[PDB]
Amino acid sequence: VNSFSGYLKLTDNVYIKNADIVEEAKKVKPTVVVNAANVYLKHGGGVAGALNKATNNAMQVESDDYIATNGPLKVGGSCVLSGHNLAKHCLHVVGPNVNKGEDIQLLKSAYENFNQHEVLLAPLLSAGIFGADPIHSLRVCVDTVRTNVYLAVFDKNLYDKLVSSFLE
Numbered sequence: 001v002n003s004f005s006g007y008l009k010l011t012d013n014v015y016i017k018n019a020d021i022v023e024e025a026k027k028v029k030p031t032v033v034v035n036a037a038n039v040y041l042k043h044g045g046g047v048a049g050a051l052n053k054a055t056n057n058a059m060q061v062e063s064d065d066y067i068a069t070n071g072p073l074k075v076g077g078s079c080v081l082s083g084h085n086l087a088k089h090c091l092h093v094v095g096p097n098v099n100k101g102e103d104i105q106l107l108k109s110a111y112e113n114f115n116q117h118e119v120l121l122a123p124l125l126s127a128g129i130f131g132a133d134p135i136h137s138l139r140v141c142v143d144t145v146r147t148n149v150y151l152a153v154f155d156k157n158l159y160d161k162l163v164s165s166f167l168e
């Protein structure tokens with residue numbers, strides 16, 4: 001469990017790797033994988049779609065049941081559902097979608113949810129279609145998360161920009 005390999009330590013508690021978060025979950029067997037969720041837990045693309053596809057749609061079926069029963073999440077909020085074949089748990093975290101006019105200050109609230117778990121495999125939040133600057137998202141992660149977070153960044157050019165941003 002939690003067999004993280006080849007990470008670069010950026011701070012006392014934040015680590016980073018140029019890797020596919022699905023292949024990392026399969027290798028590492030983490031206690032927790034973080035999903036970059038939306039408030040209706042509709043896993044239609046990006047990390048959410050990739051994680052759901054790796055679970056053979058189990059995650060979407062679970063999530064549909066959760067939302068029908070319990071209603072939508074709030075921006076900045078989270079829920080813990082099954083990790084299926086990827087992890088013990090999936091922490092579904094909703095970062096703000098600034099492309100849709102949501103407030104970037106809620107990225108802090110989103111990352112604060114990581115402090116309820118000793119160690120996490122995670123993507124950067126509010127990246128991709130959510131429209132935040134990835135360098136800013138890494139900074140909020142570093143400033144907010146105090147538990148151990150292993151970040152997986154798929155794109156090499158972005159990984160390099162993030163690491164360079166951070167150590168040069």
Ligand SMILES: Cc1ccc2cc(C(=O)O)[nH]c2c1
Pocket residue numbers: 001029030031083084085086087088
């Ligand atoms: C699929 C999977 C991956 C990691 C873990 C870790 C646990 C545990 O601590 O009980 N269960 C898992 C299941």
